[PDB]
Amino acid sequence: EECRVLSIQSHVIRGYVGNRAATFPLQVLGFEIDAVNSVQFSNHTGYAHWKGQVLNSDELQELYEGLRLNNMNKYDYVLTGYTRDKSFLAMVVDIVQELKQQNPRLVYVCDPVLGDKWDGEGSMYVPEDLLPVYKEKVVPLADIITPNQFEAELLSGRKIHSQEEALRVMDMLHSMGPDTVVITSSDLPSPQGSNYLIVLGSQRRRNPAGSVVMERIRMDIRKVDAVFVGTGDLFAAMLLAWTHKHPNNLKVACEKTVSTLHHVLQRTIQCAKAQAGEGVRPSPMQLELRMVQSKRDIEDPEIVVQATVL
Amino acid sequence: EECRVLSIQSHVIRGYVGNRAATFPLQVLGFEIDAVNSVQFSNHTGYAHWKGQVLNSDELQELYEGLRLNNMNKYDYVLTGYTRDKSFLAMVVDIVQELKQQNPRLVYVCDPVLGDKWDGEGSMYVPEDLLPVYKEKVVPLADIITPNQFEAELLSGRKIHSQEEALRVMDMLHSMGPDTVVITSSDLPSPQGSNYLIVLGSQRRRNPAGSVVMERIRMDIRKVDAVFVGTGDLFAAMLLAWTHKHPNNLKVACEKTVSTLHHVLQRTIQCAKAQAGEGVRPSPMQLELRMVQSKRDIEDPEIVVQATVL
Ligand SMILES: Nc1ncnc2c1ncn2[C@@H]1O[C@H](COP(=O)(O)OP(=O)(O)OP(=O)(O)O)[C@@H](O)[C@H]1O
Ligand SMILES: Nc1ncnc2c1ncn2[C@@H]1O[C@H](COP(=O)(O)OP(=O)(O)OP(=O)(O)O)[C@@H](O)[C@H]1O
Ligand SMILES: COCc1c(COP(=O)(O)O)cnc(C)c1O
Ligand SMILES: COCc1c(COP(=O)(O)O)cnc(C)c1O
Ligand SMILES: [Mg+2]
Ligand SMILES: [Mg+2]
Ligand SMILES: [Mg+2]
Ligand SMILES: [Mg+2]
Ligand code: NA
Ligand code: NA
């Protein structure tokens, strides 16, 4: 009785992004998550300053060699996110692969971090020579991917202007490999305002009888006037967690994931406003996620937003 | 309204030692703990194999500069443990000195890892050139130290054959600087039977009126027939937590600390035996701390041991 996860992400001393946004939450939910830190920086790169070291593909390979020699290369899930190096990303592919040989039932949850959009136009935040690797090597191996609108577009090659185009892109993404695709954020039109960001879910699965079916969901989340870092990593981590508990219920899984984010952010923005005054926009430091103060919400998130069925 | 802790210890991918044994429990208890991973290995050195890389003193300084450049050099506590390099430890002393300059109220919890004793004879397991650094620079800075019997011996130059010699050696360490000294394990005889190890605590403090008072405690812990790794790091992390919540009550802080280790170990030995099989001695892998499954015990440990005031 234990679920083992190998998470290969960034590590920071101060703050919560990468393995720091993902680890504590999964530990609180009872997963045996082993963290491989692809980097060690003082804090995330949205700060005015930051210093640190990165891990190269050789060292990553070296670290994996250790686990293998000890016959500890048996996981239930693998989790990856922001990766800045192509050789590193390739080594990750070689690793997930072997781990999948060892355990065919392994679920590779992949957050294909490539970039995002701002105001209107989007741009990459990672080496462009990563996109082909993700397309031909990483995604075909993935079981669950969580790209944002911009990443869904780059991966599929199609731009998204409406919900129906999103769904079509999702199907394209399903054909590339993963049975679960969740667009974690988008500027799609919303009947509630425009102050809302849209989340779209799509999961294909074989039912008991053996019929292959697909469940689709949509969520309209009201925007918080501030920029957060780590929340996508958190999103992917909780999705892993909740699909694990509700494997045939994408609706409930996403509602628990999105609600956990809501409570963490609500608490985070309250503490930030007070920290740096009335009217003052909080600094990156003050906007760090109140992760430990949110233990209870992570354990049993009260559902504050139900998804609409598609 | 945070209590920030800076823990500089080792990191392993699989298992619980160093920062792996200290972070989760401190996070669970509500502390904003930031982890500097002095090393990143696949697993602890108690296994037949282990690969990984170390962090050099330049890199440690580099990371520290990132924190300083951002004004994130304000901690309430600093926690250190096993260090193999003398250069690294020196750099650590310099960092603590400055952090103390930045905050005169900072509490430095030092676990002076040097070695241990297997049935009678002691043995060091880190460079011998570290003892002077510890005696001269490290311990003088520390506010709370927690050596096992052997380290306290080395640190003082005085052999411990009984409780009262242990209390005399602890009084010597207080004079070296630290106001709280806790011997985390010893060969001392117990009126409980041979199957018991002894823990001794000593706290030098000031009372309202303004006079310096001493509190001395003893605990007889039932030995578990197995070698665990990470338990000392956990002891030091939990002693930090509970002394923080119970400032002038070494007795309680120790009862909660030792009780926590008790529940964690009872759960560990049980799962280990269930895997190894009746009669069979569990392997290191099977004895890895059941940290995540012990969350509730960490939050509020049921006191299964009462400390006797000396
Ligand atoms: N400003 C915000 N207001 C409200 N919710 C937000 C905000 N920022 C992030 N979130 C929450 O975090 C989730 C992830 O969004 P984010 O924009 O953080 O990740 P992404 O950009 O979607 O993922 P990634 O960059 O890792 O591929 C959103 O779906 C939402 O639930
Ligand atoms: N075999 C065991 N049986 C019972 N308790 C144990 C056992 N091993 C460790 N412990 C628990 O761990 C605590 C610390 O002992 P350990 O021997 O683990 O650390 P130390 O050697 O005292 O510290 P360090 O090695 O970090 O300087 C003990 O006080 C006890 O609570
Ligand atoms: C600008 O990148 C910040 C960042 C994030 C942000 O994730 P998100 O909160 O935008 O989802 C994750 N990992 C690392 C290492 C990061 O540096
Ligand atoms: C023999 O030391 C094992 C070990 C510990 C043990 O702590 P303890 O369980 O003996 O208290 C801590 N950190 C590293 C890197 C270690 O390798
Ligand atoms: Mg975004
Ligand atoms: Mg990310
Ligand atoms: Mg010991
Ligand atoms: Mg130790
Ligand atoms: Na995403
Ligand atoms: Na000790």
Residue numbers in the entry:
A (entry chain B), B (entry chain A): 3 to 312
Text lifted from the article:
In the presence of MgATP, this enzyme catalyzes the phosphorylation of the three inactive primary forms of vitamin B6, i.e. pyridoxine (PN), pyridoxamine (PM), and pyridoxal (PL) to their 5′-phosphorylated forms, PNP, PMP and PLP, respectively. PL kinase is a homodimer with each active site exclusively formed by a single monomer.
We also co-crystallized hPL kinase with ginkgotoxin (4′-O-methylpyridoxine) and MgATP, and the ternary complex structure was refined to 2.15 Å resolution. The binding mode of MgATP is conserved as previously described for the wild-type hPL kinase-MgATP complex. The two molecules of ginkgotoxin are bound to the PL binding sites of the two enzyme monomers. The displacement of the ginkgotoxin phosphorylated analog toward ATP has placed its phosphate group about 3 Å from the ATP γ-phosphate group, as compared to the ∼6 Å closest distance between the ginkgotoxin C5′-OH and the ATP γ-phosphate. Like the hPL kinase D235A structure, we also observed a second bound Mg2+ at each active site that lies close to the ginkgotoxin phosphate and mediates an interaction with the ATP γ-phosphate, helping to dissipate the negative charges.
